[PDB]
Design a protein around this ligand. Structure first.
Ligand SMILES: Cc1cc2nc3c(=O)[nH]c(=O)nc-3n(C[C@H](O)[C@H](O)[C@H](O)COP(=O)(O)O)c2cc1C
Ligand SMILES: Cc1cc2nc3c(=O)[nH]c(=O)nc-3n(C[C@H](O)[C@H](O)[C@H](O)COP(=O)(O)O)c2cc1C
Ligand SMILES: [Fe+3]
Ligand SMILES: [Fe+3]
Ligand SMILES: [Fe+3]
Ligand SMILES: [Fe+3]
Ligand SMILES: [Kr]
Ligand SMILES: [Kr]
Ligand SMILES: [Kr]
Ligand SMILES: [Kr]
Ligand SMILES: [Kr]
Ligand SMILES: [Kr]
Ligand SMILES: [O]
Ligand SMILES: [O]
Lengths: 400, 400
């Protein structure tokens, strides 16, 4: 275990090997961690657990830190399997131990564990839990951030905010604190996390942070459930969340496509050139969805002011990976972004219009489409270059 | 080169390494071949070429077999890059050589190569081309099998049908003839090919084969553009095509899904059990689309009488891989098949109905959906088992 602050002990689990989260929908290229915390004042409080596959090690390590019978209260901020997965294993040893959580958490905890006989205690925003020595836990409900059961626990005196998923990132390191790790690698994982997970809940992020700041409670540390503990200027991740929530976009255009014989690829490269030689301020990224990291693509879309999506016409419809990715974007609900569909066809085509429509369904403001037959020759590549020019002029943030 | 029959020489290219076709949409687990044929009578005729990346070797090997100037005619049955990719390289040495192909082939050849100055000769069904010694080539147009430019060339006397893509398969072997290779491995690749490529054109397969049989031309060998040359009972692949075209299905149910925390997986296994203990005649396959071969899944759907598709609700929509796969199935246009959507959700859900609708759009006859909240307990797993029972009774081919 690692001493977080005074009597706060990190008793979680590092995961260096993990490469897949939420099925295979979130690639964790730098691993992750599952942060559990043991607070030992007059009362002994355990905050969240770890993933189920590390339950054996979790309980054993917990035994080495404290007798399980001496644990007074258990707090569950979030009942997703990576934070409450070791719950059944632990409650088998101490079934009478009270569990403090939201009303929605009872549904989610029981939904996974099927032990409704456990002693649940419904908490709501403002509720307190005294642990002795002048310190107490203050609960704040954060529904749909990112789950209905989500909440945060604040420890007075030590001024430590247990935010669970919020302000966390999938980043594994032997050092626990943010000022002890690589800042660049830390920022990438933080932005990668929000873009792929918290984007559809951005409208809720700002009012919640505003509400919490209204409590006027000091924050010395922010102990998330994933990644580093923010102790050195901890509110820096809060400020990033405020910026990322306000329909974040840079002067950047993300182009991604799928192709069977490189015809659409040729179009994408010609479009990109037209943009770069029209607007030097625009950062341009290009991805083949069949050969690229899906989450890296989505992170760029989040940072971009607009995207161009390419697909060849395959069996009167679009290519599956493109359709799949667009479907996911429909759930992420990106805002204040523009889009243009393009692609090659053999005869009748139809996949470009089909794509443009679904992008509109995903919330993108659609510009005109670009279509080409078979492999683009020099003349066709000019039209693609010109399309990029028209896009660059239409999507220009400042005049030029 | 390999002697196919008399003066027919195989001058194509084997591809042991290839693992991806049509982008990454067709996995070639046993490699493939690109069959080109040189006929040397009084006239010298080249039939199709190879993929562009093997163009250097193709021309060189062709030089070792014959002087390029001695080539009289060039036949292009199909202008896809794997059969006409080495065309530009070859025509650079012999630009005056006539090219015999369909009217639609001129559009496709020029579309890729951009050399309209080539000497094209439009052929239609019934047209002949004398090559001497009492032998001649007879052309038969096969539009949308699988391309608009597709055609077949028949050689009289030797009774050899050059079918290009038709009756071919992606299977690489040192031996050229069908009776020299592994029959099981040969059948798998043949069925894998049709299911993923020729399924949406099944309505056209039967009348075309009927028309060709109406010509009363003998067939000693069938020389495709991919895989083995059928010389031992060559019509066996024709009979398989007739069966596969007639909305082929076995007493078989294919279940596939995507899951984030295995809840939907638990549902799929419970459904499968219900079916097996209700109808012992049904063959059941289960696939996680995130961890399985996509084409193996589609091959099973082709053989199946009906499918069950699972998805968890993710951001108010379905999982991308499922959406992507369903999109592709919408293009494959499977016929006379039934379907049932299922999956787990956290709160409001919605992805199961969304999936059931798109399956209906894909042409599946939809049965009732099955929904479960979070992780299924013993009671919920009974409902899933019962759902399988109801499906097994509804989809039963014979009474029982
Ligand atoms: C399996 C397959 C299916 C196709 N289906 C269509 C189609 O339905 N309509 C069409 O106009 N072209 C169709 N085509 C032709 C392609 O759209 C054409 O080759 C395109 O220019 C290539 O795009 P890409 O190289 O960027 O992947 C199909 C090609 C393949 C290989
Ligand atoms: C990223 C993510 C998004 C989710 N979105 C929804 C949702 O929009 N609606 C819902 O009812 N449940 C949602 N859930 C909860 C899942 O549907 C729930 O955990 C489900 O039972 C798990 O299915 P599975 O384990 O088979 O993948 C979401 C879960 C995750 C991890
Ligand atoms: Fe979570
Ligand atoms: Fe988490
Ligand atoms: Fe082809
Ligand atoms: Fe082919
Ligand atoms: Kr969160
Ligand atoms: Kr937040
Ligand atoms: Kr906050
Ligand atoms: Kr074909
Ligand atoms: Kr055919
Ligand atoms: Kr035939
Ligand atoms: O989580
Ligand atoms: O092909």
């Amino acid at each position: 275990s690692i001493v977080v602050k005074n009597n706060i002990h990190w008793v979680g689990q590092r995961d260096w090997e993990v490469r897949d989260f939420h099925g295979t929908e979130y690639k964790t290229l730098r691993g992750s961690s599952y942060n559990s915390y043991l607070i030992r004042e007059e009362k002994n409080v355990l905050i969240d657990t770890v993933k189920h596959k590390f339950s054996r090690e979790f309980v054993q390590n917990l035994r080495n830190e404290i007798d399980l019978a001496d644990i007074d209260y258990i707090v569950i901020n979030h009942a997703e399997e990576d934070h409450a997965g070791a719950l059944t294993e632990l409650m088998a040893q101490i079934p009478d131990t009270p569990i403090y959580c939201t009303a929605n958490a009872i549904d989610s905890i029981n939904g996974h564990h099927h032990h409704p006989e456990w002693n649940f205690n419904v908490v709501k925003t403002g509720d307190t839990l005294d642990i002795g020595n002048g310190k107490q836990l203050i609960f704040v409900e954060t529904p749909m951030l990112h789950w209905p059961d989500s909440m945060m626990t604040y420890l007075t005196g030590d001024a430590v905010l247990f935010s669970n998923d919020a302000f966390g990132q999938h980043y594994c390191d032997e050092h626990l604190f943010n000022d002890e790790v690589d800042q660049t690698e830390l920022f990438e994982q933080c932005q990668r996390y929000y873009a792929n997970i918290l984007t559809p809940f951005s409208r809720l992020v700002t009012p919640k942070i505003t509400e919490i700041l209204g409590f006027n409670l000091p924050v010395d540390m922010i102990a998330t459930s994933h990644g580093v503990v923010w102790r050195d200027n901890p509110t820096q991740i809060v400020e990033l969340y405020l910026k990322w929530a306000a329909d974040y976009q840079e002067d950047r255009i993300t182009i991604f496509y799928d192709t069977m014989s490189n015809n659409t690829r040729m179009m994408a490269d010609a479009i990109a050139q037209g943009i770069a030689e029209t607007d030097p301020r625009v950062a341009v990224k290009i991805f083949n969805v069949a050969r690229s990291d899906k989450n890296e693509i989505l992170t760029n879309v989040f940072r971009s002011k607009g995207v161009l999506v390419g697909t060849s016409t395959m069996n009167n419809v679009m290519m599956p990976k493109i359709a799949g990715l667009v479907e996911e974007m429909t759930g992420l609900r990106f805002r204040n972004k523009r889009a243009s569909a393009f692609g090659s066809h053999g005869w009748s085509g139809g996949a470009v219009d089909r794509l443009s429509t679904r992008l509109q369904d995903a919330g993108f403001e659609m510009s005109l489409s670009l279509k080409a037959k078979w492999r683009p020759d020099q003349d066709a590549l000019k039209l693609c270059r010109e399309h990029g020019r028209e896009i660059a002029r239409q999507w220009a943030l400042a005049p030029l």
